[PDB]
Amino acid sequence: GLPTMLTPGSSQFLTSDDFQSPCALPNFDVTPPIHIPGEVFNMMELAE
Amino acid sequence: GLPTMLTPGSSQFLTSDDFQSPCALPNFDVTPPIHIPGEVFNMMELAEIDSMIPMNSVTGKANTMEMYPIPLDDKGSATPIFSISLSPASDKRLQYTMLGEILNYYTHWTGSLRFTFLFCGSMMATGKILLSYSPPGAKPPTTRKDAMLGTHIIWDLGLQSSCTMLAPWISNTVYRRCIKDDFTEGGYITCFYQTRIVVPSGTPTSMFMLAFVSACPDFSVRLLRDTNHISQRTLFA
Amino acid sequence: GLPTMLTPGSSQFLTSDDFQSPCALPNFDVTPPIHIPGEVFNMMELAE
Amino acid sequence: PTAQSTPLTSGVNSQEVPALTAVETGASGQAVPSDVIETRHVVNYKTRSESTLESFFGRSACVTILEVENFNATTDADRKKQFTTWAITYTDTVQLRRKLEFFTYSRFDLEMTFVITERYYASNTGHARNQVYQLMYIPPGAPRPTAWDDYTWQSSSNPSVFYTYGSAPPRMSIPYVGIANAYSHFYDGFARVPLKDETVDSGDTYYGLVTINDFGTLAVRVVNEYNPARITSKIRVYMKPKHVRCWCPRPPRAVPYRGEGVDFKQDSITPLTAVENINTF
Amino acid sequence: PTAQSTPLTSGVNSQEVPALTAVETGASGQAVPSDVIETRHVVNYKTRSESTLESFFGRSACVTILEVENFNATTDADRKKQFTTWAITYTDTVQLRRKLEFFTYSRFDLEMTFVITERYYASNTGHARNQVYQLMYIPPGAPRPTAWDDYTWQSSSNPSVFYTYGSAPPRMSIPYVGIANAYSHFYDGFARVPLKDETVDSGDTYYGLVTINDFGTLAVRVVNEYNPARITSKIRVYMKPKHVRCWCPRPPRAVPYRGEGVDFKQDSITPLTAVENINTF
Amino acid sequence: PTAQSTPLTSGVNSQEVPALTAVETGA
Amino acid sequence: GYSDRVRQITLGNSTITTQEAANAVVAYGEWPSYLDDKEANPIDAPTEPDVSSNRFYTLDSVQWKSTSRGWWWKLPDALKDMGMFGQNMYYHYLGRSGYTVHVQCNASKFHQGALGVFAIPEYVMACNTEAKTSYVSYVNANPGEKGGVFDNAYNPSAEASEGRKFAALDYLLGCGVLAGNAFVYPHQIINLRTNNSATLVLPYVNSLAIDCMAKHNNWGLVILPLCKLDYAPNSSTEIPITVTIAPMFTEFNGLRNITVPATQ
Amino acid sequence: GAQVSSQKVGATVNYTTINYYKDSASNAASKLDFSQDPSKFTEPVKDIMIKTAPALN
Amino acid sequence: GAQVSSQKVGATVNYTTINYYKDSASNAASKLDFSQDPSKFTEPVKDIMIKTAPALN
Amino acid sequence: GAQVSSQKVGATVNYTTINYYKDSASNAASKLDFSQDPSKFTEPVKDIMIKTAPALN
């Protein structure tokens, strides 16, 4: 049992967080991607 | 005391999780394995085995051995011999096949389906039979001249007892859903006399054939789900 | 504060567990061992 | 990888005329300040990091609110409050939907997060022990619960998450589960072709994405049996698209939604407020 | 390691006839689309990853529900509500059982998980301090409790887990504990041979797996003594087979179970719904 | 480090008699 | 010119021929064998009776009629009173065996019908009373060489003692699963226009290396009419089905006095 | 002693694993086994049947 | 198996990442993609138009 | 300073251990000791007795 200590923030849900989470559908084989025209990467592309 | 912080999900029990857990019986010496015949590794191995379609599950014959044999005779009718939709998980007949049973533990399927037919008349009986697969989007075929415009095979009866018709993977979506669903409809399988069955005297003029279904090697399934074919109201003890 | 997440089992007391625990008497100098006759290592020794 | 710097330019007197173009071509205007004024050199260290699709969509957004209760249910309608089901979708709310609908197609993994809240229904009926919730994902085809305590909840194959009240909001990831090569936010079509002289009724058939979409059902219950005190609960569901790619940009929604489709409402199609005058700073 | 791709083939006019076979041999049909139509080349990147036994069985599934209570027990039947015992097995429920019974034999480690829930029995008898549960695994031969507070619970050798209410669902792993080289889901035999002219009664003897199986008992109690408020609790037990191997596939269960064995019920042996006609799309 | 394996043996007809001992010895 | 329609099988002092076979099946792709030193369990030197017991024993024939619903046997049980195999079985506590199963059914070019021949590991069947579960007598579970029959009706007995037998309901394969899926078990079909025999070679199958034969049947042999018998000149006709089975690689452990099971 | 493996491809593609307990039973799910060969169920015949050949001679 | 990357510059500028789960869907946000080329939307013309040249000849 | 050992075989077969405390008493269970020799209890005789020989001459 490795000694740890919780810091402020513990158990909170910040909507802009960036953490990992367990997959509800493990070993799921996603549909292979194919090329689709008109890919966008940045919203500034649209502002131009 | 090493500084940590709990993230969302903490203390939850997800039934599909994949974590380690302490052993309640530490240092347990398991029974050494030995070789047992018939090891299975993937459920698709079982979907590739032929199983009989209960094609003739009409009133009186459903839920009896007589649901399996498809009636045939020497009278050369122009009406179809059988007709069935390519909905291998949802259909009232296909869903109870081994393939259909496995598909009902999954949400998505893709691949080619293999329909294999065994003629069980006398050796003196001859005949030619058309087996068709028409992909969806048009009038369902009720006549041979519409059935033959689709994917078909003409089966000549002979020493080789069985004939395989394929329903190749022809779909808009990459996977079809394992439910009745118009968007992922699979099309229509039908059967007609190409000539007719002919017999001499002293020979039965009506008879049967058996229809089997299995998945091809391009077949796969996704999204494990619970089946609709088993339930309970109270628990056994 | 290093991001962690508790899994099922957390805070449970399994009597057959095998974890570490802090010593209530730190830096205790145990009595040096000496040889004693008749040491046993396995209960099957006694069954024989 | 920064936004563009401005070079040092002075004036011109030239047959080169970058200030003029012809937008009939389909090309937007291309000219920049250096083409039409004297500019100084400015090094631009600023980046467009926060307008990448990942940044733009990188938030957990509320997509619905569900209600479920735990009390002694005598009547039939009260039994149906002991659990609840929801067709999973991004369309019950407007905020995330609108952001997604900047694009025709998209492809991403999901981060599902839930916020669960309780209150007492009345003061004089004793207290209630701490509740455990079950959230079960029922993929299309799997049997749906008719009661809060029937066989469906044993969830031998459906993924379920058991949440203990007071604990950290539960959370899981979903892959890109689409049966196409991307999700479609718009589908200009039908689920089947209505054929000539068929009896099947096409007087009450629907149009577009709603006829083809089906991501399954979320079923929710309180695993506890009834306390003397009735407890009503709310389940807020949150979605965050991650590992995002999108295709074919579209104009954003300008007027209130009224359904799961693109239809608009007659009393709400005047987004602009008129200006006093075309000359009005 | 993907599912099969389709090669580019055109037509034939040949003495080779892959469309015909003879299933009398025991062989299933082997032909594929390329054998009977013209095909294009399609590269297949899709895998059968989610139909491996590990994926198929990789879920925690409910296998039973137990009840236990904590109140001041005067009568004898009320004393027996203070604890509870259960013969450990996969057969009390139907969902996981059916999946396991796709196979005759199997071999795996187990992940046991528990979900524990409480409610008050009445409103006007004060409150109750937070309860600790003891779940004790009693292997065959070890003495079983006759009361919730007798000597058996000191559990000097039996594995026990002490769970505090409100904490994360408790969980532990069990090895492959079978006394054979695999578990048997079916045993077409008896526990002993009845011999000629013996007095031993074989008028009430049982058949098959039930006569030979015995994985032991799970005993459960609330370690707390009674509060003025009576608290009834439920213990849901979950099993996940992991590190799975299986042998000798079987047809799946087609009709409702009625026992721990393969017997069926007379009013429930009509699984199929009849079709209008053999020609019915 | 396992428990003992059993070797392949057949019969005997010998002056060696491992079936007999004398537990008076303490063995 | 060797066809797979002609075949000969010799085991011990017995030989079988067929001129209208349909290949042969080796169950789960595995030929029987003796038990390896690295998979052994009981430690006494085993008895391997070789040719005395590893030979073709031929059961009483049964009659296939248009009304017939099917037949079943269990295995080692059908051979329990067959010559020296039977003696070795009953004199020993433990025993293991593979089998060559040869099902014989000939007719004519003018008959028609199809028999499914299935070899089922651990063929547990349902009992015939709903007052109890798993409630079958040893005597009914082990009919011996005469086997049993399927029915197309399920009539569980009222009083518990009357239905201490199998409810061999044909379309549920006697065990709550649809018969159309029996093809996941090792099988052949005797379709009268194509063949007159079925041949299955079975290895030992169990969760153990060796088990008590008098307690436990390893294989079930099932013969279901998939398409009913028919013959135009006389549909009341009957043709025999004959079952011939040979133990293979038999190996017995734990010798003592003879086991004599109860008969009522 | 940390194993590093490819994770299942979704829509920095490796994951790390350390076993914390001394019994293999405690470990998480077995890594994907793509073994298969349905021949023992789909084609358990003694003599090889070439698809293009007749099944019966 | 730990990836080390530059973090976003604010007002010891690297951060460490280890993927704990076996499905890529479980992973945190994709590292910043600075790809772009608005030409497919702003200038999807067949024949190249040089800014300084006339758009029409 | 992490020890890596074989775990007990059940039905990526190593596990990692780091001791977090400064007293050996804090440590988890001792690694399996397969020492044994029952002779001191089963055969504590002064003169060797060969099984095949007579125990008494």
Numbering used by the authors:
A (entry chain 3), C (entry chain 3): 1 to 48
B (entry chain 3): 1 to 237
D (entry chain 1), E (entry chain 1): 25 to 305
F (entry chain 1): 25 to 51
G (entry chain 2): 8 to 271
H (entry chain 4), I (entry chain 4), J (entry chain 4): 2 to 12, 24 to 69
What does the primary publication say about this deposited structure?
Coxsackievirus A24 variant (CVA24v) and enterovirus 70 (EV70) are responsible for several outbreaks of a highly contagious eye disease called acute hemorrhagic conjunctivitis (AHC). However, the AHC-causing human picornaviruses CVA24v and EV70 use glycan-containing receptors for cell attachment. As is typical for picornaviruses, the four capsid proteins (VP1-4) assemble into an icosahedral pseudo T3-capsid. CVA24v recognizes the receptor at a solvent exposed site on the virus shell by interactions with a single capsid protein VP1.
We detected additional difference electron density towards the pentameric VP1 channel in all structures. This electron density does not result from glycan binding and is most likely a remainder of the virus preparation, as it is observed in a different crystal form (CVA24v-acidic).
